[PDB]
Write a protein that binds this ligand. Structure first.
Ligand SMILES: *[C@@H](C(=O)O)[C@H](O)C(=O)N[C@@H](CC(C)C)C(=O)NCCCCNC(N)=[NH2+]
Length: 212
């Protein structure tokens, strides 16, 4: 795998989103990976519905949090609508999948990256954007403005984001806190520190969709 990956430069990343007050990071993370794999496999970059996962992923808890794995399993078993068809409202509502016409995209499954393994995550990111989790509660992460973020942070992961690239010393993360946070909505998180958890627990739980 190459020394640098940046899926934005390959046209596989849609504009940075803002989840707002809703605890929907898990759906935004999943959607970033779906947008990415659909671009990688089909050549078209589309926006897909975080709101649909929020409403319809029965294993998740709406705006009270959820599981990227479970949203990706929802997209593989059923599908997902375009963001235009099923726009983001920042609140959980009734599942309206059935009323929004045929799905726009469908995946074939969900792999997990071997956790606590930097190279395994890097290998996956080289193939596609990956849903990853981290500790975002620390004021250092909340107030991050730029540079390669080293913490301070623990490994008490509580926030789902998407890895869309990496470099020699960092992993490139698309956050869902709007374009004004971090580096136009992104954070580069230091890697290669030898901490198996990853900085901020970044290697705790990583999933990506499979699409044949
Ligand atoms: C993240 C966010 O929107 O900022 C959000 O709080 C979230 O989904 N967090 C996850 C943790 C990471 C994905 C590791 C989470 O807490 N998932 C489990 C949901 C817990 C909610 N349970 C109940 N009973 N309300």
């Amino acid at each position: 795998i190459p020394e640098y990956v940046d899926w934005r430069q390959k046209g596989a990343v849609t504009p940075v989103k803002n989840q707002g007050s809703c605890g929907s990071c898990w759906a935004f993370s999943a959607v970033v990976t779906i947008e990415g794999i659909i671009k990688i496999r089909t050549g078209n970059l589309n926006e897909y519905s975080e709101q649909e996962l929020l409403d319809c992923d029965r294993r998740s808890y709406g705006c009270n949090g959820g599981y990227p794995w479970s949203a990706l399993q929802l997209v593989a078993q059923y599908g997902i609508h375009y963001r235009n068809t099923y726009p983001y409202e920042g609140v959980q509502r009734y599942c309206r999948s059935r009323e929004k016409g045929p799905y726009a995209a469908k995946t074939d499954g969900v792999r997990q990256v071997q956790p606590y393994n930097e190279g395994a995550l890097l290998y996956s990111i080289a193939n596609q954007p990956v849903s990853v989790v981290l500790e975002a509660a620390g004021k250092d992460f909340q107030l991050y403005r730029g540079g390669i973020f080293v913490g301070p942070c623990g490994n008490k992961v509580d926030h789902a984001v998407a890895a869309v690239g990496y470099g020699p010393n960092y992993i490139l993360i698309k956050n869902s806190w709007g374009t004004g946070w971090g580096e136009n909505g992104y954070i580069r998180i230091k890697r290669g520190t030898g901490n198996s958890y990853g900085v901020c627990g970044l290697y705790t739980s990583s999933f990506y969709p499979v699409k044949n």
